[PDB]
């Protein structure tokens, strides 16, 4: 019959914006600027964003709108020989939800920890502290800061684990937090986009209210301007070296999330003649804008720390979870009205993640709802069963050694898998399906064909951009380690199964059905590379 549609067009933009703007906008982009020549980093970042990042973002949004199905069904119809891409991409989204939500739980665990007059991560004189505790970050490995010890010894209890083999007790206060995450996700994704498209109003918008309050509070502290200098002081020497271009390339690729089945699913509920090209430019921009803003919010407070708290800038200008769960909370602890800044900061971190968890789950629910009507007829049923598997195995990550498990998933779940997956997406649409067929479809939707620029980027720039990332990725491999702990050989290999279990779907499904059509080899390719539309 008729496929449902976003109750309103802002539900779509916030769902896309919510999915694209998450914690990596805060804890990686600013760091990369600070590290790769300040403002100058914007050159290769914008070039990598213009030639590689946004072309891919646009492609998947158009594909999703035009073909009107989740990732499995969609790739089945574009190039039947490569329906495997659809499986590979849904699997990668499956693995990622196994750990991405526990990081939202951390957010909530700190939020429920900030309901107090004296934030616990301030001092070095608690039952969980060592004698080597010190009040703020330093540069000597055996002497952690008061906030590093709280996060490590009270919240995680990671000190009580000897590695991936030794997971230890289950922190039920974390398990409780994780379940609150999956409950929020349920009655948001429960009834489909009718309601999901609504809650993203809060989850995608709340982070801007909090970014605004913290931007002001941060810019008005002593030392604020010094931070912005470390953030943006141009130094074009970096641009000469490939590593900057690789960090640019890699950041733009993961910050936009193209070829993950989420943009595909979200757009598939659009109206056929919607100006998906306008939407690609608007939302992709708001994503990079949000990162630029966040840098001021972060480095304002970073300079404050270096001006009044006596810490070396390079000791607090970190990336990843340490920035938001250790360094920035430590600075909040020292300013007036600390309890307020913490409560809203962790509620921002959670809403920054929920948006994106939503999208990952939807890419699965949609893809499966569109290949298995049994599932589409029993959504509430299916989703309840999905988030229960997520939660049950998620408990592995709430154990004392749980971080060792997370770190493993994080590197492998969507590591090289996703690069290969979308590399085959770019090839499929541009070379098997054909930019002609693709441009023609777009003209039928929005009135006009994509410019020659996009056709070129989809055809040549994107795939070189993509394996430019993968080649320097491989060329810099290192066995999995965390802070003096070396993962056993068996743990490493176990991750390769996770990594390759999705990628293999591509050649497997190809082989599986290439061997299932009749006739000459040439007569079987042509059957397997004739689109579904071209056969109506």
């Amino acid at each position, epitope marked *: 019959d008729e496929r449902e549609t976003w109750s309103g067009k802002v539900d779509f933009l916030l769902s896309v914006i919510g999915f694209a703007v998450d914690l990596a906008n805060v804890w990686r982009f600013p760091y990369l600027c600070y590290k790769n020549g300040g403002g100058a980093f914007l050159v290769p970042y914008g070039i990598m964003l213009a030639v590689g990042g946004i072309p891919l973002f646009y492609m998947e949004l158009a594909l999703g709108q035009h073909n009107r199905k989740g990732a499995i069904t969609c790739w089945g119809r574009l190039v039947p020989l490569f329906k495997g891409i659809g499986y590979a991409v849904v699997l990668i989204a499956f693995y990622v939800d196994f750990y991405y939500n526990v990081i939202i739980a951390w957010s909530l665990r700190f939020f429920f920890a900030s309901f107090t007059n004296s934030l616990p991560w301030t001092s070095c004189n608690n039952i969980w502290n060592t004698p080597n505790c010190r009040p703020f970050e330093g540069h000597v490995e055996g002497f952690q800061s008061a906030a590093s010890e709280y996060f490590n010894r009270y919240i995680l209890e990671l000190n009580r684990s000897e590695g991936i083999h030794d997971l230890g007790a289950i922190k039920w206060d974390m398990a409780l937090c994780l379940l609150i995450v999956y409950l929020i996700c349920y009655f948001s994704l429960w009834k489909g986009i009718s309601t999901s498209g609504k809650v993203v109003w809060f989850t995608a918008l709340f982070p801007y209210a909090v970014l605004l309050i913290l931007l002001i509070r941060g810019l008005t502290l002593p030392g604020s301007f010094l931070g912005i200098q470390y953030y943006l002081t141009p130094n074009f020497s970096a641009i000469y070296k490939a590593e900057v271009w690789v960090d640019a390339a890699t950041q733009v690729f993961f910050s936009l999330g193209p070829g993950f089945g989420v943009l595909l699913a979200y757009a598939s509920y659009n109206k056929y003649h919607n100006n998906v090209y306008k939407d690609a430019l608007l939302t992709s921009f708001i994503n990079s804008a949000t990162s630029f803003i966040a840098g001021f919010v972060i480095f304002s407070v970073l300079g404050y720390m270096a001006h009044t708290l006596g810490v070396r800038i390079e000791d607090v200008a970190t990336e990843g979870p340490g920035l938001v769960f250790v360094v920035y909370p430590a600075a909040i602890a020292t300013m007036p009205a600390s309890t307020f800044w913490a409560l809203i900061f962790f509620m921002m971190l959670a809403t920054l993640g929920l948006d994106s968890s939503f999208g990952g789950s939807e890419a699965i629910i949609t893809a499966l709802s569109d290949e298995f009507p049994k599932i589409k007829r029993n959504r509430e049923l299916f989703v309840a069963g999905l988030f229960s598997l997520y939660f049950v195995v998620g408990l592995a990550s709430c154990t004392q050694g749980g971080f060792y498990f997370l770190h493993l998933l994080d590197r492998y779940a969507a590591g090289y898998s996703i690069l290969v997956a979308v590399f085959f997406e770019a090839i499929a649409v541009s070379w098997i399906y054909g930019t*002609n067929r693709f441009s*023609e479809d777009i003209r039928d939707m929005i009135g006009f064909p994509p410019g020659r620029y996009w056709q070129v980027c989809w055809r040549f720039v994107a795939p070189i951009f993509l394996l430019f990332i993968t080649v320097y990725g491989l060329i810099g491999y290192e066995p999995l380690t965390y802070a003096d702990y070396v993962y056993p050989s068996w743990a490493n290999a176990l991750g390769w199964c996770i990594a390759g279990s999705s990628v293999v779907m591509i050649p497997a499904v190809a082989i599986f059905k290439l061997l299932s059509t009749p006739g000459s080899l040439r007569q079987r390719f042509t059957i397997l590379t004739t689109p579904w539309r071209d056969q109506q």
Partner: antibody
Framework: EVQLVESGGGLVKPGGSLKLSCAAS????????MSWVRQSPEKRLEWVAE????????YYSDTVTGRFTISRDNARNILHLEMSSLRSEDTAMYYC????????????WGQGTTLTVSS | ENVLTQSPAIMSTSPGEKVTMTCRAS???????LHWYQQKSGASPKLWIY???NLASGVPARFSGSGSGTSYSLTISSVEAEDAATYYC?????????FGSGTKLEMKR
């Protein structure tokens, strides 16, 4: 330099059938949707049928849908219109028009070819 | 079907005078999808104004266009004799594509 020439077209009996042709040149015919626009002797312009650049998207006027078949030969660079079950009110001069961008309209037109449907 | 009516049908003007003609659509039309064609006697149409207000290649600056929704208009500031023609509007936002009934612009003498 873009150039469009319609051909075929003449007197046909009611119920008869006839095939019009538009020879394109001076551009990449295959990058551009084409349409047939007719103009009756009372000078009213009526759009008839549109074919996408790669023939995969086709719209018809309701007044001809069923009896007319637009098609393209992107190798020979010819647009065709196959008309059958012709009625007298199909009498008009038939225009071949290039129109790839809906937001830019039909930016090139041919000289036209004249169809008379009388007994 | 989106019906486009034009006024006046025939209209006379003296060279130099200002001429203005209107296009009314049964149903709203996005401004990027409304165009104008000029057709001189015994010749074929030529794209004249696209996307409401842009002049096509070769169209002199004396021509302008404006409008939105269901009311658009074509305006010649100082009309010349080589502007005698019939002007058709056209909407390109919904199938079936439709043309207006035309305005014949004739010369006063």
């Amino acid at each position: 330099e873009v150039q469009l020439v319609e051909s075929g077209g003449g007197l046909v009996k009611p119920g008869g059938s006839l095939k019009l042709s538009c020879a394109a040149s001076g551009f990449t015919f295959s990058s551009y949707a084409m349409s047939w626009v007719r103009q009756s002797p009372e000078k009213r312009l009526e759009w008839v049928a549109e074919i996408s650049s790669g023939g995969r998207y086709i719209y018809y006027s309701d007044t001809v849908t069923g009896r007319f078949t637009i098609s393209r030969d992107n190798a020979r660079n010819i647009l065709h219109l196959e008309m059958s079950s012709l009625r007298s009110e199909d009498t008009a001069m038939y225009y071949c028009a290039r129109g790839e961008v809906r937001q830019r309209g039909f930016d090139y037109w041919g000289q036209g070819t004249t169809l008379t449907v009388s007994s | 079907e989106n019906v486009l009516t034009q006024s006046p049908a025939i209209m006379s003007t003296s060279p130099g005078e200002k001429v203005t003609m209107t296009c009314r659509a049964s149903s709203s039309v996005g401004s990027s999808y409304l165009h104008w064609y000029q057709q001189k006697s015994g010749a074929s149409p030529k794209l004249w104004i696209y996307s409401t207000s842009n002049l096509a290649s070769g169209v002199p600056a004396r021509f302008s266009g404006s409008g939105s929704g269901t009311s658009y208009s074509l305006t010649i500031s100082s009309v010349e004799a080589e502007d005698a023609a019939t002007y058709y509007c056209q909407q390109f936002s919904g199938y079936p594509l439709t043309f207006g009934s035309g305005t014949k612009l004739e010369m006063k003498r």
